[PDB]
């Protein structure tokens, strides 16, 4: 019930029509939660959260950030620098995301 239509290949490709369509259909018989679950359970083994927490802690300890939203913005900004101890999410769970999302996206 879903046609790729050359699938908008580039990782940077900015398509929201297809994305909101697929996401909307996918939300029915929700899969988002399955991905989230599998990912956390597969996210903790690599030892990333401790890195993140220690960084956030340092940020709070220095006193540079003094509110949770600011801490969130600061840290999300920091992790975002995947391209640059790295706060980048391990490639393993990315491959896992690829697998499970592919599997759950194959059905549609």
């Amino acid at each position: 019930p879903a046609a790729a239509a050359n699938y908008t290949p580039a990782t940077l490709d900015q398509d929201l029509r297809s994305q909101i369509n697929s996401l909307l259909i996918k939300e029915g018989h929700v899969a988002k939660i399955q991905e989230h679950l599998l990912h956390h359970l597969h996210a903790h083994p690599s030892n990333w959260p401790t890195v993140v927490q220690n960084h956030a802690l340092s940020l709070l300890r220095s006193g540079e950030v003094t509110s949770f939203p600011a801490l969130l913005r600061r840290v999300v900004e920091d992790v975002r620098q995947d391209t640059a101890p790295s706060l980048a999410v391990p490639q393993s769970v990315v491959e896992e995301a690829l697998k499970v999302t592919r599997e759950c996206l194959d059905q549609l």
Binding site: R61, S62, G63, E64, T66
Partner: protein, 171 residues
């Protein structure tokens, strides 16, 4: 943001000798290292000794704006705000600004809390007697009785915060 800049002294100069002596006193107290320099937390304490309990944000702003790097730090590398220190000048200027910016009511509220330790909400004769015992000087009970009775407008047997502030700010 401009950074490492020395703070202005204009708000420190208009102080009296007593105050300046108290600042220097606090500094010298918390200056255990004797290097004429304070750590961040020592500076926080120095301000807390003057009766300022500022939030981390404000002291951190002070830290980045007016914090000087330590000597041991290699100049070829960047220094984080937290590892910076305060000379006497910065502490003086900052404390001065803080003091002249201070609302006159704060010290009085603090004092009211010092007199009324039980948190009853008012100062009674007994409290004044305890404080008298703390000061060391013995005052006749007529005086303290007059200290309460003259300013008690409710006949409650003590003086509340409002009355304390009003009587203490009155000319």
């Amino acid at each position: 943001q401009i950074q490492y800049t020395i703070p202005p002294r204009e708000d420190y100069n208009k102080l009296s000798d007593e105050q300046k002596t108290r600042i220097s006193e606090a500094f010298e107290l918390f200056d255990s290292n004797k290097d004429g320099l304070l750590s961040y937390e020592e500076f926080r304490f120095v301000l807390r000794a003057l009766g300022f309990d500022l939030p981390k944000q404000q002291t951190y702003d002070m830290l980045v704006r007016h914090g000087q790097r330590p000597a041991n730090w290699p100049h070829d590398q960047e220094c984080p705000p937290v590892y910076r220190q305060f000379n006497l000048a910065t502490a003086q200027a900052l404390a001065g600004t803080l003091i002249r910016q201070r609302d006159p009511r704060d010290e009085l509220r603090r004092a009211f809390r010092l007199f009324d330790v039980d948190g009853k909400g008012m100062i009674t004769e007994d409290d004044l007697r305890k404080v008298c015992q703390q000061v060391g000087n013995n005052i006749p009970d007529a005086d303290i009785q007059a200290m309460i009775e003259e300013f008690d407008s409710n006949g409650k047997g003590g003086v509340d915060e409002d009355e304390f502030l009003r009587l203490m700010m009155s000319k």
